[PDB]
Design a protein around this nucleic acid. Structure first.
Ligand code: NA
Ligand code: NI
Ligand code: NI
Length: 327
DNA sequence: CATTAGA
DNA sequence: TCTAATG
């Protein structure tokens, strides 16, 4: 957590680069397990040789570790940091819609910057285009103050359309966060579950709703179970307009809400820990359900859930307010 | 880890 | 169809 920092950080710096600027899936894959295991080791790596005893640690990384340890740097680490092409790749990546593949592609073309990106707006797809348009807002944080306003509106229309609608704004927001990065909206309806062969319109209704009243302004990707867009708060009585903010709505079988609800609510660790618990308590938890464990090794049979409580009761745990779902 | 776009 | 990119 801190005695192997410099090792874990450089190593990750190492991993990410092969992953991105290079196409070395394995190397990359190599750098991460080590940085993973060099992470769990309870003592101060004092030498490569020392490290080396590790699993996944070979001659290459170890050699590396000696250099880092000896001198407070790595050349391999310094050259790349310096490298313009590689730089650029990391940057271009920042364009929502922009992935390593395309970032590499734009580069060879000579598209390095932001401006280079604009000047060839033609070269981008919708997504990337959108992203291009809202790069500054895109990167900005979401004050809960606003998260407050946002949610308001959204349950509003949701309701408006059909009163049978269940919207919940999940994630860090849900957990009290003073700030967020995009809103996540969990959506369900009775009239939609596990079997009941869809009702794409269900999602459909609501997205339309939001646009209709101007909350929704763009479309990043619209599917029959997963929308992904952008949004904006009606810029007041002037002098102050709201920054474009990402958005995502998702339909779900009413019979698997809460797990997902629970799940998407985190925290990652809260989840992981609770789930870990369910295991002892003879259960299995995941994003869509809750099945009791059969000694045979495993088992199935999704237990009925009506609320965040049910899952709790099941694994006979203390109800934890989302506030305190931190871990 | 699944959904969407896209070519 | 596969491959990319988001979450
Ligand atoms: Na990106
Ligand atoms: Ni368009
Ligand atoms: Ni979200």
């Amino acid at each position: 957590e801190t005695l192997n920092g410099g090792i874990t950080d450089m190593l990750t710096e190492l991993a990410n680069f092969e992953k991105n600027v290079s196409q070395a899936i394995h190397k990359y894959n190599a750098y991460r397990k080590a940085a993973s295991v060099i992470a769990k080791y309870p003592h101060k790596i004092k030498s490569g040789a020392e490290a080396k005893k590790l699993p996944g640690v070979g001659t290459k990384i170890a050699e590396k570790i000696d250099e880092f340890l000896a001198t407070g740097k790595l050349r391999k680490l310094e050259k790349i940091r310096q490298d313009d092409t590689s730089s650029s790749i990391n940057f271009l990546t920042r364009v929502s819609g922009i992935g390593p593949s395309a970032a590499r592609k734009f580069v060879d073309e000579g598209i390095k910057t932001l401006e280079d990106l604009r000047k060839n707006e033609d070269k981008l797809n919708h997504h990337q285009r959108i992203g291009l348009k809202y790069f500054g807002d895109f990167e900005k944080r979401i004050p809960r103050e606003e998260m407050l306003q946002m949610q308001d509106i959204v349950l509003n229309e949701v309701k408006k359309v059909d009163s049978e609608y269940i919207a919940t704004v999940c994630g860090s927001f849900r957990r009290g966060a003073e700030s967020s990065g995009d809103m996540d909206v969990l959506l369900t309806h009775p009239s939609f579950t596990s079997e009941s062969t869809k009702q794409p319109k269900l999602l459909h209704q609501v997205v339309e709703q939001l646009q209709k009243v101007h909350f929704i302004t763009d479309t990043l990707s619209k599917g029959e179970t997963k929308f992904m867009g952008v949004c904006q708060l009606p810029s007041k009585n002037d002098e102050k307009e709201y920054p474009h903010r990402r958005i995502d709505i998702r339909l779900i079988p009413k019979d698997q809400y809460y797990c997902g609800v629970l799940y998407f609510t985190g925290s990652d660790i809260f989840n992981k820990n609770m789930r870990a618990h369910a295991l002892e308590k003879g259960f299995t938890i995941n994003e869509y359900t809750i099945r009791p464990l059969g000694v045979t090794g495993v088992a199935g049979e999704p237990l009925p859930v009506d609320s965040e409580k049910d899952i709790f009761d099941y694994i006979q745990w203390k109800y934890r307010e989302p506030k305190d779902r931190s871990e």
